[PDB]
Each structure stands twice: as structure tokens, then as C-alpha cells.
Design a protein around this nucleic acid. Structure first.
Ligand SMILES: [Mg+2]
Ligand SMILES: [Mg+2]
Ligand SMILES: [Mg+2]
Ligand SMILES: [Mg+2]
Ligand SMILES: [Mg+2]
Ligand SMILES: [Mg+2]
Ligand SMILES: [Mg+2]
Ligand SMILES: [Mg+2]
Ligand SMILES: [Mg+2]
Ligand SMILES: [Mg+2]
Ligand SMILES: [Mg+2]
Ligand SMILES: [Mg+2]
Ligand SMILES: [Mg+2]
Ligand SMILES: [Mg+2]
Ligand SMILES: [Mg+2]
Ligand SMILES: [Zn+2]
Lengths: 82, 33, 49, 149, 83
RNA sequence: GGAACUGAGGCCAUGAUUAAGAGGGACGGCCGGGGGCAUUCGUAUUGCGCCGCUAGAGGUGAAAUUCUUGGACCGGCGCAAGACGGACCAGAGCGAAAGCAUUUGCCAAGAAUGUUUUCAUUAAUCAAGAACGAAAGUCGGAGGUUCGAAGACGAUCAGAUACCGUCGUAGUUCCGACCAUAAACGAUGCCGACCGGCGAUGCGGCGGCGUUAUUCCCAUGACCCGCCGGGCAGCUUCCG
């Protein structure tokens, strides 16, 4: 087999492995800022959302939950946080 | 049991068959037409 | 010896396997999206200087 | 693997190494608590409350923000569940299967599934009695289960 | 009559072609401050911004309210119920 | 109106840390000949009615019992009954096993995947004990097309060449009670850890140069490439 250093994995190796099988566990999910269409209020939405997220200003549907990730509505803009 | 032999032979030949097919591939009304 | 000979055959199989998946990646991607690395300076992580 | 099912899976959550609240979070410890009190009065379980805060309010972990777990926060305020959440849901499932089974005598599979559910109830109840969450006379009965939940 | 139809649709196709080329150029491409717009030209399906789509997703959540909003879970839910 | 001292009450709550590539529960979108109830279609077979035509039809190695001029067999149209679910169907999928295949609706359940949700050791193996358990078979009801142990008839050449034909009892079908056995096989206890490569395959998720359709509702897919999990199976192998 290939020779790997167990103490010093490369960045490409750790991002490919399963999240529980890395040297130190780390999630693949993240939080994002979404900007509503029609009113430009900003809402913080989890990437793998399991509930329908409404804009606080106008109660517009911002996302709909799916199996893996929440699909965003047409016309909104988003940014990753942190 | 020789029933598995024909199955395992067919499974391998199918995989080789995938290889060869991969290699083998390598005026206003005008819009409706 | 058979122990050395077996490892030579196995490591040859793995190396050509990685090459096959690499040419597939560059084919089904943007022409400029794949950096090209020399085999010599591939193994150098960093020079602190 | 699973306690009863043959399959073994690896799907779960992976907590981050860093335990600190991110800077962009503008909610305080007190602000999160009043949100928990509001949703509990609406009739939401502690598992569902944590889901809502994660999806909409950007609270990844209530424990890292306030220093206390959701159930511990509710107990201190006085909004404690009558029955433990995992035990409560198992009893609810057994009632639904038993109601279905009384209209279908020929469903052998449902009869088999009912036995497995009741086994998990007995294991869970035995643990809770040792921890003194339940009185040492609590018993699960099929007729009593409907009134229990 | 035939000339006007041909002239009209020739101009219409040219306008349509320009819009597609501009949309392809803008697809992705975070702007200043780093906002990325969500369109149908990506590989992930997106929720349409139509009245029918919003009513469908909200109705699905409303049918689930019975299961997720409980009436006898908490101790207080029993005591003012007995009143 | 201010301050400083001080005194007893009433409710609720009373806990070592973390969050196991241990386990349970919840949540999300999917997925499957998994199960139960109802509904529905398809030829075929059998029986019956009518029409046309006229000596044979059936069966075998050869025949013979049997049916036929009061019309058999064959051709057409229509009606009824009971079973069955071809081709598509794969070493694919589901279930603890036994097992599971026409459309649509309903009821409850489930694996895997996704999760920065929740509890916090709740776990493993197990005499005793309990649920299920192909086919055949027993008891009581309802039906009976096809097939068919038993039985009665007709024959019984080749031959180490060796078990036919016509009719067809119990059964085969359904609803309840029993019975608890199979080459019920990998002829092969369970849980945990460690220990080589290479591709396909089913499901779920993630990323993607390009093709191909497009969304009132219904729906956001089909193909190609890389990666990650748990499955069904393979090709090759070092040490042991
Ligand atoms: Mg899971
Ligand atoms: Mg994709
Ligand atoms: Mg854990
Ligand atoms: Mg389904
Ligand atoms: Mg199904
Ligand atoms: Mg006649
Ligand atoms: Mg006829
Ligand atoms: Mg069919
Ligand atoms: Mg039987
Ligand atoms: Mg029988
Ligand atoms: Mg009988
Ligand atoms: Mg068998
Ligand atoms: Mg055995
Ligand atoms: Mg599957
Ligand atoms: Mg897939
Ligand atoms: Zn808005």
C-alpha cells in the first residue's frame, strides 16, 4: 500500500475522509446569511435545515428542507459565515 | 455448483463489455424543425 | 524474493489506478481548473527559509 | 449495530472541537432562555426546541451559549415533562400499533413489531427506576398506556 | 404579412440570445461583499418564487403540526387540563 | 418624603466532567415483489346458449376404454364460475426466518443516508420463559375451474431401455382452530477490535466540463466524471 504519515495528513486527505474517521472530528455543515427578496433583511440559516425558514420581516419562504441540504428559493443571495 | 460458475463468468464478461463500449465511443417556423 | 516481487506488482497497479482517475478528472472539468505539478517538487511541502 | 435491527450504520452528528460561541451570534444567554420558555409553552419537546434554534436563530449549541442543557433549563423554570421524552415516544408508538392491530387480526408482522417495542419499554423503564426518575411501582400496561400518554 | 412576422421574430431571438449569454456570465461570480445569487442555472434544484410553490410547502408543514405540537407532554399540560 | 439598621413567611429547584467511528429517542427528504384491508384489470381454462359445416375426434411405441349424423372435433358471437398473476424478471430489491410480483386507495411499521437536535451508560451474551415457523396433515364452516394421492376401467412394444391412457375420490382455493416438522445449508454461535489491492452494482448524501428535457397542478429529472457511508455480490492476492 501507499505510505501515509498518520500524524501529518495532508489537507486534501482529511477533507475527503468521513467526518467521524478524521484524526479530530469536524462537521461539514455551516451557517450562512441569506438576503430575502422583496425586503433585504438578512437571516441566519443552517445549511442542512430541517424546517421551513421564513423571513422575519415579511414571512416569505426562504428555504425548503430536503434529504441533505435545504434548497433556497429563487432570487435570494447567500454568504457563508465565520 | 456450476450454477455459480456461469453467474461469475457472466459478471466478469459484463465488466469487460463496459470497457469496449467506453473505447468504442472514443424562418419563423425553423425553430420547430 | 516473492515478498519483494509481490509488492512491486501491487504498487504498480495502484499507481496506474491513480493516473486513470486523474485523467478522468481533468477531462470532465474546466481546462484551467487543474494545477499541474512536477513529480520532483510534488514531495516538497514547504521551504521555511 | 442496532439493538434489534440487523443493520449497522454510522450516521450521526459530529461536534466541533471549538466550544466557544461565534462572534456573529448577537443573542445573549438570557435571550436564548426566553425563546426556550416560549416554545415549550407551545408544546414542543426539548429535541424539537433545539432544532428550531439551530435552523433559524443560529444557535448551534444551547449548552455552549447558556452553560446548561435544554431539559435542565426547563426543569429549573418549572416546565418539566411528566414523562421522559424517549420513554414517552415509545409508549405512543405502542398505542398506535395496538390500535391498528385490533382492527387487523391477520397482521402477523405488526404483532411481531409490537413485541420488539415493548421490550425497549421494559429496558428503558428498568433504567429509569434505578435512577429514581420513575417511582419503584410504575408499570407499563396495555390498557393503562392509553391514559399514560 | 410574412415579412413582418420574420422581422419580429428575428429581433425577438436576438434579444433572447443576449439575455442567456449575460446570465451565463453572471452565474456564480460573488460580487463585492461576497453575495452569491441563487438561480436555476446551477446544478442544485431551487424553489421557484411563485405563489403555488409557497402554498405547497406551507401546507405540508401545516399537516405536520398535529404530530410535533403535543398536548399532554409537559406536567403543566396535565394540571390546568384537570381544571 | 427620604435613607441606614435589621425580623419572620409563601411558591418552584436542588446536579462531578465529557458527549464514545457504544446504545436509545426525535427530526428531514427519499427508498423497497416487507405486512394488513378494500378496489381493479388481463388473457387462458372450464361450462352454457345460438349460428356455419360435415365424419370423424381423442390418445399411444402400437393401441384400446371414451365422445360422435339427436352433429362430436373445428370456425364465429355472447354469458357465467373458480383459479392464476407470463414475457419485462436481474444472482437485482425487501423481511428475524419461513418467505414476498396486475392497477388504484387506505392503515400501521422499517433499513440506510443527512444532522453543530435530545438523553447520558440506558450495554453484550443468555438456561427458564414467550411470539413466528414452507409443504403435507387433523377439526368445524364456504366453495369447487384446473390439477390430482386413492379407486375403477383400457392396455401392457421395445427392454440394463422400467410405470402409459380415460374417468377422476380426499385434497389443491377461502374463513376460523390445531399440528411445529424440511438437504428449514455457507452441510459453518453471537457481540467487539485488528488485519491487502482492483473495479462494478442497489440505496442515500456531496462536488462537477459538458449533453438532454422541462414544470398551473403534478413535478425539479435522464446520461457522464470524482468522492463519502451502510448493503448484495465478484476478480485477484502477502503472511497466517
Ligand atoms: Mg441516523
Ligand atoms: Mg448533482
Ligand atoms: Mg455520540
Ligand atoms: Mg414508500
Ligand atoms: Mg413499500
Ligand atoms: Mg351446432
Ligand atoms: Mg366452440
Ligand atoms: Mg405481470
Ligand atoms: Mg402450511
Ligand atoms: Mg391444506
Ligand atoms: Mg375440510
Ligand atoms: Mg428454502
Ligand atoms: Mg444450520
Ligand atoms: Mg436498496
Ligand atoms: Mg447514488
Ligand atoms: Zn423578507
Amino acid at each position: 500500500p501507499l505510505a501515509k504519515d498518520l500524524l501529518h495528513p495532508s489537507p486534501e486527505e482529511e477533507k475527503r475522509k468521513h467526518k467521524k474517521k478524521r484524526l479530530v472530528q469536524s462537521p461539514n455543515s455551516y451557517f450562512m446569511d441569506v438576503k430575502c427578496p422583496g425586503c433585504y433583511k438578512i437571516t441566519t440559516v443552517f445549511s442542512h435545515a430541517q424546517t421551513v425558514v421564513l423571513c422575519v420581516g415579511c414571512s416569505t419562504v426562504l428555504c425548503q428542507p430536503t434529504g441533505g441540504k435545504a434548497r433556497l428559493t429563487e432570487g435570494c443571495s447567500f454568504r457563508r459565515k465565520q | 455448483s456450476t450454477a455459480s460458475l456461469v453467474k461469475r463468468k457472466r459478471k466478469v464478461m459484463d465488466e469487460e463489455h463496459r470497457d469496449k463500449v467506453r473505447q468504442s465511443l472514443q424562418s419563423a417556423l425553423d425553430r420547430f424543425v | 524474493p516473492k515478498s519483494i516481487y509481490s509488492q512491486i506488482q501491487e504498487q504498480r497497479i495502484m499507481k496506474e489506478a491513480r493516473r486513470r482517475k486523474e485523467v478522468n478528472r481533468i477531462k470532465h472539468s474546466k481546462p484551467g481548473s487543474v494545477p499541474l505539478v512536477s513529480e520532483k517538487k510534488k514531495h516538497v511541502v514547504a521551504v521555511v527559509k | 449495530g442496532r439493538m434489534h435491527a440487523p443493520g449497522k450504520g454510522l450516521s450521526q452528528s459530529a461536534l466541533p472541537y471549538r466550544r466557544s460561541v461565534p462572534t456573529w451570534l448577537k443573542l445573549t444567554s438570557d435571550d436564548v432562555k426566553e425563546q426556550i420558555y416560549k416554545l415549550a409553552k407551545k408544546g414542543l419537546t426539548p429535541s424539537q426546541i433545539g432544532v428550531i434554534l439551530r435552523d433559524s436563530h443560529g444557535v448551534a449549541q444551547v449548552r455552549f451559549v447558556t452553560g446548561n442543557k435544554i431539559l435542565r433549563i426547563l426543569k429549573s423554570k418549572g416546565l418539566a415533562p411528566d414523562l421522559p421524552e424517549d420513554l414517552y415516544h415509545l409508549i405512543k408508538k405502542a398505542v398506535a400499533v395496538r390500535k391498528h392491530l385490533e382492527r387487523n387480526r391477520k397482521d402477523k408482522d405488526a404483532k411481531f413489531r409490537l413485541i420488539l417495542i415493548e421490550s425497549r419499554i421494559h429496558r428503558l423503564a428498568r433504567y429509569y427506576k434505578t435512577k429514581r426518575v420513575l417511582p419503584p411501582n410504575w408499570k407499563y400496561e396495555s390498557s393503562t398506556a392509553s391514559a399514560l400518554v | 404579412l410574412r415579412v413582418e412576422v420574420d422581422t419580429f421574430m428575428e429581433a425577438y431571438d436576438q434579444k433572447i440570445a443576449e439575455e442567456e449569454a449575460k446570465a451565463k456570465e453572471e452565474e456564480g461570480v460573488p460580487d463585492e461583499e461576497g453575495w452569491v445569487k441563487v438561480t436555476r442555472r446551477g446544478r442544485r434544484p431551487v424553489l421557484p418564487r411563485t405563489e403555488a410553490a409557497s402554498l405547497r410547502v406551507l401546507e405540508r408543514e401545516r399537516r405536520k403540526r398535529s404530530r410535533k405540537e403535543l398536548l399532554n407532554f409537559y406536567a403543566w399540560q396535565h394540571r390546568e387540563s384537570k381544571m
